[PDB]
Amino acid sequence: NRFEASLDAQDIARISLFTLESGVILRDVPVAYKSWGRMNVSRDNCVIVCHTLTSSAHVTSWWPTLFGQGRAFDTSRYFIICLNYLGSPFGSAGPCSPDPDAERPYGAKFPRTTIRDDVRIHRQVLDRLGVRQIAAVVGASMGGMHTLEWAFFGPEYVRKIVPIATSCRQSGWCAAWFETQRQCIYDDPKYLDGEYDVDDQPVRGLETARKIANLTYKSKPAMDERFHMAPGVGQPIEAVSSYLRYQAQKFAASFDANCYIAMTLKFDTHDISRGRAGSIPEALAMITQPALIICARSDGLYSFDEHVEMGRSIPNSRLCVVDTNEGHDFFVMEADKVNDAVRGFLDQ
Amino acid sequence: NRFEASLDAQDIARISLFTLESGVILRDVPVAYKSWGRMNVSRDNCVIVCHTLTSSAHVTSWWPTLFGQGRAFDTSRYFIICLNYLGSPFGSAGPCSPDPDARPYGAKFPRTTIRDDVRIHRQVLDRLGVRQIAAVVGASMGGMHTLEWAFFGPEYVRKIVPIATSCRQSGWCAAWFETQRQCIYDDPKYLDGEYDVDDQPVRGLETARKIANLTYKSKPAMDERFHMAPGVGQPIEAVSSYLRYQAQKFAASFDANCYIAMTLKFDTHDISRGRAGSIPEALAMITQPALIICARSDGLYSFDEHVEMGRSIPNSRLCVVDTNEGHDFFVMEADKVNDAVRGFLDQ
């Protein structure tokens, strides 16, 4: 697995049998994770960070300024842990990991997993590490979906949550965007129904998917600052072409197509209320922990309004609106502001 | 030209020589157009409608309810005319039309700008004997031409209705349209624009159009159309084929090289270049009454930029359509746009 191989050192837990909520049984299941800091004697200073769609468990690589003495993820006070999602190419069971029923990797036959499946298996790993209580879950985008799900363990196990730039349930809007992206991959003749060779990926599908995704993560103001026309009578508009190509090419060179499909399909299963309550507001009201909901007005995927709805129905919640024009991106572009918010909340 | 061939009847004007603002000279240039109604004796009841990126001059086919007695484009009062842009597959000079130096222009059709279209169109209007224009009305790309028509001055162009549009190309829109063109550039069937006309880069074109179509939507509109069953088409399952369906139809009935040519036009747009030092200063040179129509959740052309138009155009009124639709709105909410345009044309 070349994708996992490119990472810094990390731990693997192996779960010998795991029942997906579909009823499919996974065997000999690796769950990759990375932790920083030390558990206290009481084993109750654990902070779980939930990562983003295409990231690895190594949160330090895109959230580096959230880490360290006095920062949000204060390695002097907390045991910070991030566990890799099923479906990912970075160590946990997914299309890229060995299939024990044919050993060859799962490839295109890796079962469907849900947000709730990840939360369940990740908590099994924590039980093994001996974690007795969780000081906080913090996660953005896809990770704020897991964060909301962790909360349902109750306030005795999960003390606080910080869902960032996220939703309670899949929306038509995002479903359409991610389906569009998946279709770019399905239509690449190199895809071969997911049977492609690992070093002959559907590169053009993946790029195109990534370009789309990357723009949905931006805002109009942000792209307008970055590229504009000369006054009347890179930065110029000419430079857009290669901006788009550059980072999309890098991603396609270093991510797996089948994992992109598997991970995004996870989004479609998300609903904090299914099986639990008759509506989203009623499910939100079952979240009893203090919550800090962090959002930006010009996130184009996860709306301001839906974050306001979270804050309205979660009984002990505070809404934090980041002062920015950056779009869904903001939680990375404005890392210092997110850090201050998270740290202030963790100190109460 | 199979694209032009699928249309209802229309007129063609032939301009024997036309100098593009690049300096490239086009020769024996067809300009296709379609009109409704009759000019009055004075020849001053002309309403120009500016069409959208992928549309023909046949505005009735996507704006049918704007036409008719008592409606905005009232064929009892006005001579309504829409001329086809250069670069389009539907009749005006473009990749699909005969090259006078050869066979169609194909991939070798010159860059044209918004200003080129306005100039050759106005030459056509001069031939038709139009002495004054009662109003120019247009949305998305058409709003760009609309703003450009205004620069002829209030003696020739009496009023403008720019709808869902911008004063200048933005990084945001350039990124979206360049992404779309890159879908076409990467389709192995594109062949640097040298493809055979009946073996189009269909997959590039579809993909470019799916992306485009979603950028025309809003979150609330997509959320109403597709959602999840309550806790414990309409379903999310149905998104897949919604995306394929209309995109497939488009790719079957539009030309790749034209898509490229047309979208590249967007990059040249700037009402201020050569005229003024900023956008606000150019907008202040617009002396006609203007009705600026927009929606709050247009994701391509922002509420704020229409507010800026209204702020700098001295005799302007901003009309914010009550809708949750996105860029689409001017079509989804045709009746509201009709009422606004008509009320303005009645002043």
Curated annotation (Swiss-Prot), chain A:
Its EC number is 2.3.1.175. One of its GO terms (biological process) is antibiotic biosynthetic process. The gene is CEFG. Catalyzes the conversion of deacetylcephalosporin C to cephalosporin C. The chain holds residues 66 to 441 of 444 of the full protein. Residues 47-332 form the AB hydrolase-1 domain. Keywords: Acyltransferase, Antibiotic biosynthesis, Transferase. GO terms for molecular function: deacetylcephalosporin-C acetyltransferase activity; homoserine O-acetyltransferase activity. Belongs to the AB hydrolase superfamily. MetX family. This is Acetyl-CoA--deacetylcephalosporin C acetyltransferase. The keyword Acyltransferase applies. The active site is at S141, H328. Heterodimer of chain I and chain II. Pathway: Antibiotic biosynthesis; cephalosporin C biosynthesis. It comes from the Eukaryota. It catalyses: deacetylcephalosporin C + acetyl-CoA = cephalosporin C + CoA.
